[PDB]
Amino acid sequence: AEALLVIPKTLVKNSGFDPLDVLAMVEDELDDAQDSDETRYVGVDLNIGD
Amino acid sequence: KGIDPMSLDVFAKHNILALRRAKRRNMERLQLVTGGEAQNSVEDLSPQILGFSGLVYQETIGEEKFTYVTENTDPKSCTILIKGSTHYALAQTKDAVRDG
Amino acid sequence: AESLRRDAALKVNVTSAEGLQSVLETNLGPKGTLKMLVDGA
Amino acid sequence: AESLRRDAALKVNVTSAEGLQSVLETNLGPKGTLKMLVDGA
Amino acid sequence: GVDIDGESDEGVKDIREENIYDMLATKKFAINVATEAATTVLSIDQIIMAKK
Amino acid sequence: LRELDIVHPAVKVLVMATEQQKIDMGDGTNLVMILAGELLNVSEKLISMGLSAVEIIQGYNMARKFTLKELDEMVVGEITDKNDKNELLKMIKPVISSKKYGSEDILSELVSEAVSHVLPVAQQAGEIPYFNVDSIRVVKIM
Amino acid sequence: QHLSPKDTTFIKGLVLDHGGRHPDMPTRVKNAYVLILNVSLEYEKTEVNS
């Protein structure tokens, strides 16, 4: 499971962005989606950073 | 095949576009795009052998010249023209097109 | 009387993978880096 | 270019603690080992 | 503009006196080529070579 | 550049871009190589500053589009393409300049006169090309 | 290798390398008929030089 998270950390590593900062922002959005019964996909935006 | 200099003045009065030194593999796909069958003998030529094509215009370049068979009703074929200024720009673009 | 515990060995096989990974690490993604490779040609 | 912006000599401070850890890891607990030191006098 | 001088002068002088101009086709084409030239060098973080 | 032996393959990148200036426009080869070399010096300070080279490349793409839009507003005069002997003196003078000193006055009338001989009489027609690159040959004699 | 990559366009048909070169050929021909001709339109010589 930890070996599959290197891909989103690699995309932000070349641009100089903090891989740990963008990792916590995605996990915070996935917690709100588990409570609701809807389906929403989350992804990393390299241009904006969020 | 080639073209003799005698027929150059004949095709100019009728504005008949002439070509020479054609690739054998490229002519096999012309039967699908144009629709006309290859005619070996003019004595057996039929009026239905003539195909259909759109606007044909040749670009003017000193080193080489191009012929556009494009704008066809049912071409059933495509060609991706790769342009570039340098040599590495052609290898990078060719890799991006084949990956897409 | 010769017998061993079969030491882990391994190592460099993974270490060589880390050096090769860093070559393609910066080459992946739209924001990655483009590297030049010319061998003998 | 100038300055440094790499502190990586810091890993020696962690590596120096790794050697002391492996020494004191074996003698920890009732199943540990009894260490012996000799000055030579 | 920039004056070469070579004898004497005070400050700069007008270029329109000598009518020294540059065409747009030459200047505009030189910008796109020089931009992509430095882009390739900055984009290459690794170089692999081999002896012949 | 063709008569020099290149060792590092990164140098050939600037050489290939320099040849593009000579083939198409034929002028400005010194402007391309010098400007490309300075962009690396200003980018070296950004590397030591900690700025990644990815955003440096993206910054030049935004600055290049802003520069091309300002080139149309910097145009002072417009060449009427009269092909007159006196009108061609304005374009040829800076070309001979910054190369050989003292010959700019003598070679201005010699080059401008040979161009008007090979060009026919036409105006406002760009369909059929006239001036080629082989129309002017240079010979030497002791 | 001539034109820049920014000026590239899509080709619906097929393009060929060596075309016919004549000064009086028209620039644009609309609705042209394509006819494959396998016979030689140029003078031929004996296998031995003559």
Swiss-Prot record, chain E:
Which positions, given as ranges, span the membrane? none
* Chain positions with Phosphoserine modification: S8
Cellular localisation: Cytoplasm
Role noted for this protein: Molecular chaperone; assists the folding of proteins upon ATP hydrolysis. Known to play a role, in vitro, in the folding of actin and tubulin. In yeast may play a role in mitotic spindle formation.
Subunit description: Heterooligomeric complex of about 850 to 900 kDa that forms two stacked rings, 12 to 16 nm in diameter.
Q: Please give the family membership noted in the entry.
A: Belongs to the TCP-1 chaperonin family.
Q: What name does the UniProt record give this protein?
A: T-complex protein 1 subunit theta
Q: Which organism is it from?
A: Saccharomyces cerevisiae (strain ATCC 204508 / S288c) (Baker's yeast)
What part of the entire protein does this chain span? 498 to 549 of 568
From Swiss-Prot, chain F:
Q: Which domain of life is it from?
A: Eukaryota
Location relative to the cell: Cytoplasm
Identify this protein by name: T-complex protein 1 subunit theta
Which section of the whole protein is represented?
Answer: 72 to 213 of 568
Which family does the UniProt entry place this protein in?
A: Belongs to the TCP-1 chaperonin family.
Protein source organism: Saccharomyces cerevisiae (strain ATCC 204508 / S288c) (Baker's yeast)
Fill in the subunit field for this protein: Heterooligomeric complex of about 850 to 900 kDa that forms two stacked rings, 12 to 16 nm in diameter.
Q: What does this protein do?
A: Molecular chaperone; assists the folding of proteins upon ATP hydrolysis. Known to play a role, in vitro, in the folding of actin and tubulin. In yeast may play a role in mitotic spindle formation.
UniProtKB/Swiss-Prot annotation, chain G:
Location(s), subcellular: Cytoplasm
Transmembrane region positions? none
Provide the positions where the record notes the PTM Phosphoserine.
S50
Highest rank taxon of the organism: Eukaryota
Per UniProt, subunit arrangement is: Heterooligomeric complex of about 850 to 900 kDa that forms two stacked rings, 12 to 16 nm in diameter.
Q: What does this protein do?
A: Molecular chaperone; assists the folding of proteins upon ATP hydrolysis. Known to play a role, in vitro, in the folding of actin and tubulin. In yeast may play a role in mitotic spindle formation.
Which family is it part of? Belongs to the TCP-1 chaperonin family.
Provide the protein name: T-complex protein 1 subunit zeta
What organism does this protein naturally occur in? Answer: Saccharomyces cerevisiae (strain ATCC 204508 / S288c)
Span within the parent record: 200 to 249 of 546
